[PDB]
Design a protein around this ligand. Structure first.
Ligand SMILES: CN(Cc1cccc(Cl)c1)C(=O)Cn1nnc2ccccc21
Ligand SMILES: CN(Cc1cccc(Cl)c1)C(=O)Cn1nnc2ccccc21
Lengths: 304, 304
């Protein structure tokens, strides 16, 4: 027992990290097979930042201007192309450490691990959620661009995120591995509105089930609710409206604990209306929304 | 910016994990050079659990009874020995993936990453602190024994923990890599008192400095305190007494923010006496003590 904000083991992704330098800028790249993927803003300089013309900036660059180094070994670049906001640098050597992998676009509310890197070297790994407004609340410093987010399903790494930017508000924005931003963001150094965010209701309910499994039960009550009534409370407290699809995804946890989903909703309703009264749930004094129902079952069953 | 409970990249440790089976029991082992380390309770059966006679149980075992498998490859055991609560199985092949490593005994209040494993396969990685009472609040299920805790200093893995037991209270106990338990615990299925725990004051102060660095400043006040006065408050709230050695370790963070350590102590004193007033610090509604001053600087500087 016990419940922690667990990240996937990062080894398979560490083997893919490289450093990419173009001119004066250095960031991280992801080397899979014979292609290195990195943020296209590696081609920008300090003046280019407010509104770069990426097509023009890339036309001034040749294969030999992209310096790619895998630890201490230099990679030979034999092609380059921009796809949305990523650059794809074709190299003459397939990464011998390429794991089985997929590129996936994750949905808002889903979770993933981030391997924060600097100069192609891994610094740390943490788990987070893609917010409903398509930002992530990560831990990134200058030089972390090109660090990736991923999930692992047995031996397959599904890459879902590449880091590109820290908005002036201190929240993070990035793209899928085809270079499409999550959310309305653009790769320019400008203030950009991130929409209104909400709390991921289905994840808070999953985490209350994790709490019951792991012995924290004080919040269980004698009440029940309906989806309609619960959604009036979710509206008031800026929580995502709960749907039958969310109730269905919570089925396994409901069966494992014997607590009907709407009864757990009534516990969540009372916690939203009354707060925690200075008590904690799984070591937290707030309602946690960064664990999906799949994460809770995975952590509570021991999946490798 | 941003601050997360970051674990070290786990790749170097994933390469060392193996499965060890003796009789009916399977747990994890750590393969470094030509030795596999694992908890000695791999030799116990269901009857042996209340008070195993480990010397007698091990005398019934031969090298060929220890089944060690590295992924899918079987290791040949050419020697076995018990050192405190660990078994050391000498194998005929040095692990080709052995990183540069050390065995260290960590101090209470220090932090480390855990790579949770089942059947020799990594499941997830998380960061935690060794509590002042020598327990850890981890996330472990049956089969996780032999999972290890570690820190990484550039290319060197310092292994500090091997998991052995979940106490009836749901907290975790284990040993250094020489098999010495942290705390008063013994490897038997009995209720065992874990001492009175305290909150790691120097880590809470380090985390308040991380909060100021990362923009959360609301808790800063117009006050100062002394070590003596602060320690009366620490006593009341079950916090570790602060010493000049702790103030010295906080020197770098104090210099980076320009906030004198005793002024930060006055902010911590007001938070202890008044609570958070329904506000948060770095996404937490409680005072966090699982980040050391070294962790905060490492995360805020980008060390790889
Ligand atoms: C370089 N820019 C802005 C930007 C992004 C895209 C294109 C352009 Cl042309 C300019 C960043 O925001 C890089 N960044 N990403 N995470 C960070 C964390 C802390 C400090 C900086 C960080
Ligand atoms: C087998 N024992 C008890 C024990 C420990 C040492 C020696 C003996 Cl003889 C018996 C455990 O506590 C193993 N364990 N460790 N973490 C766990 C998490 C959840 C469930 C079980 C877990």
């Amino acid at each position: 027992s016990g419940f922690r904000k667990m990240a996937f083991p990062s080894g398979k992704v560490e083997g893919c990290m490289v450093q990419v330098t173009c001119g004066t800028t250095t960031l991280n790249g992801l080397w899979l097979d014979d292609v290195v993927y990195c943020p296209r803003h590696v081609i920008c300089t300090s003046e280019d930042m407010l509104n770069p013309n990426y097509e023009d900036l890339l036309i001034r660059k040749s294969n030999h201007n992209f310096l790619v180094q895998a630890g201490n070994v230099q990679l030979r670049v034999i092609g380059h192309s921009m796809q949305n906001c990523v650059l794809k640098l074709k190299v003459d050597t397939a990464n011998p450490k390429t794991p089985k992998y997929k590129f996936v676009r994750i949905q808002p509310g889903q979770t993933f691990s981030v391997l924060a890197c600097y100069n192609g070297s891994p610094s740390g790994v943490y788990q987070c959620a893609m917010r409903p407004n398509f930002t992530i609340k990560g831990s990134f410093l200058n030089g972390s661009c090109g660090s990736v987010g991923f999930n692992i399903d047995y031996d397959c790494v599904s890459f879902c995120y590449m880091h590109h930017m820290e908005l002036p508000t201190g929240v993070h924005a990035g793209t899928d591995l085809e270079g499409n931003f999550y959310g309305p963001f653009v790769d320019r150094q400008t203030a950009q509105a991130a929409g209104t965010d909400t709390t991921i209701t289905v994840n808070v309910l999953a985490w209350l089930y994790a709490a019951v499994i792991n012995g924290d039960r004080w919040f269980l009550n004698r009440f029940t609710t309906t989806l309609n009534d619960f959604n009036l409370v979710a509206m008031k407290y800026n929580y995502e409206p709960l749907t039958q699809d969310h109730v269905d995804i919570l089925g396994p946890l409901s069966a494992q604990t014997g607590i009907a989903v709407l009864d757990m909703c009534a516990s969540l309703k009372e916690l939203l209306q009354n707060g925690m009264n200075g008590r904690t749930i799984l070591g937290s004094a707030l309602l946690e929304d960064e664990f999906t129902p799949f994460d809770v079952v995975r952590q509570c069953s021991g999946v490798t």
